[PDB]
Design an enzyme around this catalytic site. Structure first.
Site, PDB file in Angstrom:
ATOM      1  N   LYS A 153      21.010  39.243  52.573  1.00 39.88           N
ATOM      2  CA  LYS A 153      22.418  39.135  51.043  1.00 39.88           C
ATOM      3  C   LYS A 153      22.290  39.531  49.650  1.00 39.88           C
ATOM      4  CE  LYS A 153      22.410  37.516  55.581  1.00 39.88           C
ATOM      5  NZ  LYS A 153      22.445  35.960  56.402  1.00 39.88           N
ATOM      6  N   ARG A 210       1.478  48.569  57.777  1.00 37.74           N
ATOM      7  CA  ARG A 210       1.598  46.511  58.227  1.00 37.74           C
ATOM      8  C   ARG A 210       0.939  45.518  57.198  1.00 37.74           C
ATOM      9  NH1 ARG A 210      -1.291  44.550  62.817  1.00 37.74           N
ATOM     10  NH2 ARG A 210      -1.268  46.442  64.066  1.00 37.74           N
ATOM     11  N   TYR A 213      21.176  27.188  59.188  1.00 34.60           N
ATOM     12  CA  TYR A 213      21.613  29.173  59.571  1.00 34.60           C
ATOM     13  C   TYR A 213      21.915  29.205  61.384  1.00 34.60           C
ATOM     14  CZ  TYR A 213      21.684  33.980  60.680  1.00 34.60           C
ATOM     15  OH  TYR A 213      21.920  35.867  61.292  1.00 34.60           O
ATOM     16  N   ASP A 266      14.992  27.362  52.189  1.00 38.23           N
ATOM     17  CA  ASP A 266      15.678  28.712  52.311  1.00 38.23           C
ATOM     18  C   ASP A 266      16.450  28.304  51.133  1.00 38.23           C
ATOM     19  OD1 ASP A 266      16.827  30.348  52.965  1.00 38.23           O
ATOM     20  OD2 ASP A 266      17.669  30.152  55.368  1.00 38.23           O
TER      21      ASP A 266
HETATM   22  C1  LIG Z   1      23.898  36.758  63.648  1.00 35.26           C
HETATM   23  C2  LIG Z   1      25.185  37.282  62.867  1.00 35.26           C
HETATM   24  C3  LIG Z   1      24.324  37.150  61.308  1.00 35.26           C
HETATM   25  C4  LIG Z   1      25.462  36.190  60.866  1.00 35.26           C
HETATM   26  C5  LIG Z   1      24.952  36.138  59.219  1.00 35.26           C
HETATM   27  N1  LIG Z   1      23.926  36.603  59.627  1.00 35.26           N
HETATM   28  C6  LIG Z   1      26.029  35.090  58.116  1.00 35.26           C
HETATM   29  O1  LIG Z   1      25.740  33.727  58.331  1.00 35.26           O
HETATM   30  O2  LIG Z   1      26.076  35.472  57.660  1.00 35.26           O
HETATM   31  C1  LIG Z   2      -5.613  47.068  61.614  1.00 38.18           C
HETATM   32  C2  LIG Z   2      -5.122  48.567  60.735  1.00 38.18           C
HETATM   33  C3  LIG Z   2      -5.016  49.891  61.934  1.00 38.18           C
HETATM   34  C4  LIG Z   2      -5.686  50.236  63.016  1.00 38.18           C
HETATM   35  C5  LIG Z   2      -4.872  51.509  63.915  1.00 38.18           C
HETATM   36  N1  LIG Z   2      -3.791  50.970  63.594  1.00 38.18           N
HETATM   37  C6  LIG Z   2      -5.536  52.233  64.712  1.00 38.18           C
HETATM   38  O1  LIG Z   2      -6.489  51.541  65.859  1.00 38.18           O
HETATM   39  O2  LIG Z   2      -5.124  53.334  64.840  1.00 38.18           O
END
Ligand SMILES: CCCC[C@H](N)C(=O)O
Ligand SMILES: CCCC[C@H](N)C(=O)O
Ligand SMILES: CCCC[C@H](N)C(=O)O
Ligand SMILES: CCCC[C@H](N)C(=O)O
Lengths: 396, 396, 396, 396
Positions: free
Chosen positions: C209, C59, C112, C184
């Site tokens: 895209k 993460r 968008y 964007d």
């Molecule tokens: C919410 C549907 C996705 C729309 C798509 N991302 C587009 O504008 O190409």
């Molecule tokens: C931010 C590091 C992740 C910590 C881990 N998710 C744990 O507590 O097991």
């Protein structure tokens, strides 16, 4: 419509594929499964009979891999395709399906090394004999044919000097003597050469190279008549080699082949520029590339190939030591033994892969001490040329 | 420490694996690559020589697949492992490496069908002859041995009736006559049976079954002496079958095998309960399971196997029609032809996979009209029993 | 050398990537892990401090995703990158990192839809106010700025009519009033437009895209100054949105971006041909494409964009019914709502995505009853033109 | 039948999943797509309306992820599920969906650190206030409730000392005062604890831990009423966090959860043995484990949890230096900060993750200098005990 009716780029993108019927998913789903479930005893029996169609078990067939097989059949203008675990498996599944003890094969000498090992050492141990010839000379093919000859096997262009083989002419010779012609089309891809259109019976690829194009899949494909492919699948693959392709690998290859057309155009545009640079360099003794007019079989190349390819070999002044210095001096090109990736790859067989092979025995194989092989990638050609010029200048 | 020193569960989790050296990543990275890059001409030469170690090209070897190979070598107490594209490829890569025209194989008759097809039809076409015997009778193995015999090949337990083969006894016979013993250990996994510990020379698996365990990988593995495995890799796989495993498949199999111990315990605990239920059911004529005392080779099973396995076969009253009705009446068990998945799978060979085979020829093969094969999964055994009882009651 | 020194195509291929240090694997390994292991208590402390560098937990950061982040930073000429679970997450991680209750944002109206929903309904509920303006008129941006304005937000080109925004001019306005400019850049990709080079502070993409380009990844990326990116990572992503990218998704995006240059060239070459065809068609009332000289901001487009893009919108004669008939009549173009895939995608907002929206309220949004949006793929342009001509002819 | 009728192990294997309708593929296909294709303008409109059902775009929903969501809903006995990019995203998508400026949250103090950071620093900046209390004392929860309180948030068991929270009692308190109860069930998994059955309204998990179980996925899940989940999906995920889960990640999590039952049984069987060993060790001052009778809330644990869990914390004699020596002395346990993997993981917060935190401020947080946290894996418990005994003996 029918996918076989559209333009080649359209086919590259669409052939063999369609939105998922259950969900509309645009990308071919990855059917990463071993098992398939039947609705009834009867359905299982039907599929097995094999009266009826549908899936059973991934070694036998799979929806993801089927899409790839159908696409490549379309691209090569063949009836059916069969995906495999590797380029080698494509070749051996094919030949072990066709041949049995007492049979004979006429093969080009200028072929992929591992293929040569199979033909030289493994085949004879199964009672299948092989005669090697210079396939650039079609008369040598004819002269080597025997009553027992089942197959003539060729690659074009061929390593390490990118010599050519006249597919149409060899096909005619093979057929008159009752043999099949098998062509390894790995170097060109269906975008640049179509052996089936020129009379070949079966085409094999290592998709590891240009068809996948992204240097992250080992795989092969076989394309040919439905009658042959069915035997390659239900006997060759199922019973003999067991060389099936993973659905994930098929999915990646489907993904890679989407850009085959634009990749080949750029590979070849880049290679021609680099080939011309090398030909103009006073430190380079020879350059082997189908796109140069000085190539021994240039006109044949122009008739048989739509583009001259992305591979170049060349000899640097000063033999082995110069070649070693050169490859150790590149900063952008990568030292490696594969080809058809998006990155430019370079190798110097004499110091890298054939260092222990007898100098005089390499020369026989066409591998000179200064021979360098280059797989041209998608980088700016100016950067590749600058890297080469830098390394060459240092090495000489 | 050394991974070969820990307990079996610890080995299942850790053997062959360690955190990534560059990053500390705990999961084995998926090295989904074809190409490997060398630092210098010299490094490329060293690896190729093959003086020195390291990677070159995924068909030859790969870090992800190496981890799997090392783990299974540890689990089977063998020197080295070699992963393959399929269980079939494990078997054929092995045998085609060992045998050549004029050689001979003594094989059990009670073996996997596709293996039988290879041995019956393909091998002889390469000049390699095969004698089939009842391997439950070691004297038939001895009697079939010839001066040319290179290999004795067995499976235990064996389809479709889960008969056994005395590995230690057969090993002794094979060795006295100068042959190798190859054992297909797919049904048991190394958690339940260790043929190498009992004298076998080479073990093969379809990892498609219990080793992966999740019904989403086709693959095989070979375990044996380093000297043999090297030949299987650098000749058998490289040149002959081309049946290499995709790094992604190896990664999934590594992931699946993490739970091998706890999966096998539950599979077998569930199977024993279901086997006892079936044996108590007046509509079931026979139940074939190594865990029932009535099994013909029960004591052999207790010495050779740590658990009786997750597979059960049984015959339902009323033959073919009853068998068809039964499998069409299950609501939880899934109709399919694989085994060793987390889901319970069921099949009725007479109506599903052998419908066209001559009734009297099936009987010879040991496949009776009422024979059902069950691969017991990880569901609550009470639910599986209820589903079976429901379907049986309806069918009879 | 340094990757920031090579040509753009070379950077596309190489930037952020190198062979694996442990093995030489050419493809970036897929580090599909959650956990990272420390060699000692001290090493764990160092990384955490965060005195020192290395990985801890996916993460927070991951080797595969890091490669992607570094590549895109290079391509946009920014200091650092941060990958996310989606384009939306890229936008919201950015804005929620920068803004808090009482803060203000000036945003283009032509953005968008989902971004509009976030800005219109979600932001105000967190005490963050948003003023929408016509960003094609830089004076409206200036007029809307308040003492509390932290960010000006724009897209260019913008849906649905591909209007433009003068990035350099808006950057100057934003900066004079002490605000950041966020752009964007999804529609163009770094190959066609580089907002940071024109004064923007932060660039966001939906890599879903063109950057990925293969229609099989949902993901986003943020590029900007190291100081900002660190906050977006260690606060915005870590604490607020939790929108991290899966290593597999990063690997696929790395794979897709390899062909970005050649894909964009073909997308745009194809789109220009199709745009000209549409402009010549008497059944088409309007065509919106930056590559046509009739485009209201054509000269701005030529200065700001290296290519006119792969997206075209157009209005068909006969309004809503004609538009519905047309899209129901295509045989090659696929009906879907995404863009930047290798397949040509088509959609008719009035009958498909805005059917329930008030006709007069759509018109306000710039969505006319006959408006069709086309994402041009890699097929032969002649096939796409034929499909369009066929469908248009039928619809009118 | 209906999947909600079978036994829990059966549900673990089958719930939310079935063979693919198009092909019969047993494994849930990996629908690694962004785009979904419509058959007609009408079909696109129907789905969008949203009158009708089906897929549109992976950020909104996906067949692979849907299977996972349905399975976990079944396992937690909730109406609907929503998968996310991370455990953090599950928590923040939930709370940012429920709360807006002016709202209030009562939260346990003993919670996951990153969750604490979000609640302590990020929420207040959006005008959402948070009161922290000792949730082991339900009266403190009641006393902290305000007219503006929308949510009470708890974890049980809680880090770092595995204290408990009486879910049923807290649910009653929250509900009487008109608030929702959200419970983080990560530590237990649905196999060991079911907060919804005890009155909670919403359950969140980091599937990164036990649900996936294989240390190779970062992900989260939310389970609750259909009405709430729909808002979390179509507003929280779609507009606010953008924290969607990759289909590949969902597929891996589906694969991992197949063994949840047997994994939890072994984790807990192993942990109890190790906990008892530690409690008997004269060098260990305290052992925190719900399975020991000395645990302050032992009886509550027995009523609320079906198993005591796989996590243990303990204090080693000699404080910080002893703790550092100990973790640097283990040979099998791996130094890392995650939990719920198949490998045993160990960490010493005082020297590793909280080295810079004020010694007296750590003590307040319940983190003593000698506190070690252990995530017990699937190895042989005897090997883990031997490793611990070895390291402890050395450290003291
Ligand atoms: C919410 C549907 C996705 C729309 C798509 N991302 C587009 O504008 O190409
Ligand atoms: C931010 C590091 C992740 C910590 C881990 N998710 C744990 O507590 O097991
Ligand atoms: C055996 C190494 C692989 C050689 C490589 N396939 C090439 O010729 O490109
Ligand atoms: C050829 C179909 C596969 C049969 C399957 N391998 C089984 O016996 O379980």
């Amino acid at each position: 419509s029918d996918c076989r009716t559209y333009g080649f780029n359209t086919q590259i993108v669409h052939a063999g594929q369609q939105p998922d019927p259950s969900t509309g998913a645009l990308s071919t789903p990855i059917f990463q499964t071993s098992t398939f479930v039947f609705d009834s005893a009867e359905q299982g029996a039907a599929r097995f009979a094999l009266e009826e169609s549908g899936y059973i078990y991934t070694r036998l067939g799979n929806p993801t891999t089927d899409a790839l097989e159908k696409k490549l059949a379309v691209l090569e203008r063949g009836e059916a395709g069969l995906a495999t675990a590797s380029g080698i498996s494509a070749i051996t599944t094919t030949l072990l399906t066709l041949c049995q003890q007492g049979d004979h094969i006429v093969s080009a000498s200028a072929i992929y090394g591992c293929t040569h090992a199979f033909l030289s050492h493994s085949m004879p141990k199964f009672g299948i004999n092989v005669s090697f010839v210079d396939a650039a000379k079609p008369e040598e093919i004819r002269a080597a044919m025997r009553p027992e000859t089942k197959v003539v096997y060729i690659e074009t262009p061929a390593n390490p000097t990118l010599s050519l083989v006249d597919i149409e002419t060899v096909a005619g010779i093979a057929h008159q003597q009752g043999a099949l012609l098998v062509v390894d089309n790995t170097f060109m891809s269906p975008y640049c050469q179509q052996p089936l259109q020129l009379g070949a019976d079966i085409v094999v690829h290592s998709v590891t190279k240009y068809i996948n194009g992204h240097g992250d899949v080992i795989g092969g494909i076989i394309v040919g008549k439905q009658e042959f492919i069915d035997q390659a699948r239900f006997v060759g693959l199922k019973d003999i080699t067991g060389g099936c392709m993973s659905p994930f690998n098929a999915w990646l290859t489907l993904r890679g082949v989407k850009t085959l057309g634009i990749r080949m155009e750029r590979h070849c545009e880049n290679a021609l520029k680099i080939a011309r640079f090398l030909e103009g360099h006073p430190s380079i003794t020879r350059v082997y590339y189908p796109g140069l007019s000085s190539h021994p079989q240039y006109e044949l190349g122009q008739r048989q190939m739509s583009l001259p390819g992305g591979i170049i070999s060349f000899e640097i002044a000063g033999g082995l030591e110069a070649g070693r210095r050169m490859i150790n001096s590149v900063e952008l090109c990568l030292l490696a033994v594969s080809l058809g990736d998006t990155e430019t790859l370079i190798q110097h067989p004499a110091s890298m892969t054939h260092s222990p092979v007898a100098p005089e025995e390499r020369l026989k194989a066409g591998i000179t001490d200064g021979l360098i092989r280059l797989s041209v990638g998608l980088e700016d050609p100016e950067d590749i040329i600058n890297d080469l010029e830098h390394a060459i200048r240092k090495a000489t």
